[PDB]
Write a protein that binds this ligand. Structure first.
Ligand SMILES: NC(=O)c1ccc(OC(F)F)c(F)c1-c1c(Cl)c(F)cc2c1C[C@@](CN[C@H]1CC[C@H](O)CC1)(c1ccccc1)O2
Ligand SMILES: NC(=O)c1ccc(OC(F)F)c(F)c1-c1c(Cl)c(F)cc2c1C[C@@](CN[C@H]1CC[C@H](O)CC1)(c1ccccc1)O2
Ligand SMILES: C[C@@H](Sc1cc(Oc2ccc(C(F)(F)F)cc2Cl)ccc1Cl)C(=O)O
Ligand SMILES: C[C@@H](Sc1cc(Oc2ccc(C(F)(F)F)cc2Cl)ccc1Cl)C(=O)O
Lengths: 205, 205
């Protein structure tokens, strides 16, 4: 129950490469994953502002409009050890309320948006709550190409150096009221362990 | 759009075995899968003795109707497969917002061995309503049955045993008790390089 505001909780997230060996055989590799004392440490949001878009509607504007307790930083250690392909993303959210949500994902390079994906999701009542599922949303070509470039680098420290300027900002809004339900800033390194993560609350002071 | 009455369409169905090699590596094998669209008809009296036949049995269900919700699926299962999860997934669509119940009866010699009943709620999707059964666990009877079938040295022996194995799936509107879909499944083992196969028929008379 880590990435959760008072209205929406992200239970699961994964980015993957699935390969069809034959009509009945598939192999799947997870690049990153979440959810496969719940106390979280805090990170001052001013430490990361220059790695995310910062004009009207940028991270600072979003954080200041609030609610600030919907803001999180996820550090990912991505697993790139992977040899008819489908690169996708899946995520699951739950809420006590029936809403229509919008998930906006901005891929950024040097703090500037390169691509934005916006998807609207409707609720399904399930086991006492409302559930929202983004199932096999295709990874953009920019990301697939970026993964291929990173794998051509001979050392993990070189991939980490390139990843230092790569970020993703995810903003989930209530479509009916336009309130921010969840906002997640993602930062990356390549794993030397498979995939790992660390979640923090974003605060100011 | 084959398995579809006027109120419910089953777009996809699959029964699978998923294996976790490591936290980021998964393998998936499909045993069976679905998804002019004309379908041939089969006289339902040909199959009555291979399904339960008391009050609420296949004949009672067919006679109550609507008869256009009744289908026979012949499956040629792919058993060529070497931390495991055996599941079933299915997806349905409907123009109406309903609370549905899916009852699946596994039968041996026309007699129920196990019944699984699950309730599904609608999700609004581009003008219509979708229903999803995602990774519903295969009962231990089925997993054990698959293991016994694989110990047989020849596919004709598996086919002889499978001649007395059937599954009846009934999807009902929980509130009105209307039969939305009723699918009778019969099995053989596939001998094709393409893996699993199926043939769908309408059940008539
Ligand atoms: N302003 C910042 O840089 C910053 C400040 C505070 C902070 O949180 C902390 F408070 F917890 C941050 F996460 C960042 C941040 C940001 Cl915004 C960024 F976009 C990329 C990025 C980092 C850290 C890092 C350093 N990875 C590099 C790898 C190259 C090596 O040469 C130095 C470290 C990372 C470390 C571990 C796992 C993933 C990523 O890559
Ligand atoms: N009453 C029946 O037998 C029957 C009548 C009509 C009919 O369909 C027609 F209307 F289209 C049926 F599908 C069945 C039926 C039933 Cl109800 C059953 F429960 C099992 C089963 C079959 C056919 C079969 C025959 N497989 C045997 C394997 C042993 C071999 O020796 C003969 C063929 C099968 C054939 C192909 C693919 C899957 C299964 O296994
Ligand atoms: C943009 C997505 S969202 C997303 C996608 C994610 O994938 C990756 C991010 C970085 C890497 C690499 F380390 F290699 F650089 C690899 C992957 Cl696979 C992770 C987190 C997020 Cl949030 C969408 O929605 O299309
Ligand atoms: C019981 C399920 S339903 C179901 C499950 C199905 O799986 C199989 C059926 C037969 C075989 C074998 F040929 F090997 F004998 C193998 C599998 Cl994997 C097929 C159709 C249906 Cl409808 C549930 O919902 O629990």
């Amino acid at each position: 129950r880590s990435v959760a505001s008072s209205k929406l909780w992200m239970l699961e997230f994964s980015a993957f490469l699935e390969q069809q060996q034959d009509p009945d055989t598939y192999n799947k590799h997870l690049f990153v994953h979440i959810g496969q004392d719940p106390y979280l440490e805090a990170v001052d949001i001013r430490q990361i502002y220059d790695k995310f878009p910062e004009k009207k509607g940028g991270l600072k504007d979003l954080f200041e409009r609030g609610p600030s307790n919907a803001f999180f930083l996820v550090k990912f250690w991505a697993d790139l050890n992977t040899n008819s392909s489908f690169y996708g993303v899946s995520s699951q959210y739950e809420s006590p309320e029936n809403m229509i949500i919008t998930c906006s994902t901005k891929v950024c390079s040097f703090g500037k948006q390169v691509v934005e994906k916006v998807e609207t999701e409707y609720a399904r009542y399930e086991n006492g709550h409302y559930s929202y599922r983004i199932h096999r949303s295709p990874l953009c070509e920019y990301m697939i190409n970026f993964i291929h470039k990173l794998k051509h680098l001979p050392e993990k420290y070189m991939m980490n150096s390139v990843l230092e300027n790569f970020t993703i900002l995810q903003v989930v809004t209530n479509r009916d009221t336009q309130e921010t339900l969840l906002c997640i800033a993602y930062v990356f390194e390549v794993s030397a362990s498979g995939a790992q993560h660390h979640i923090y609350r974003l605060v100011k002071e």
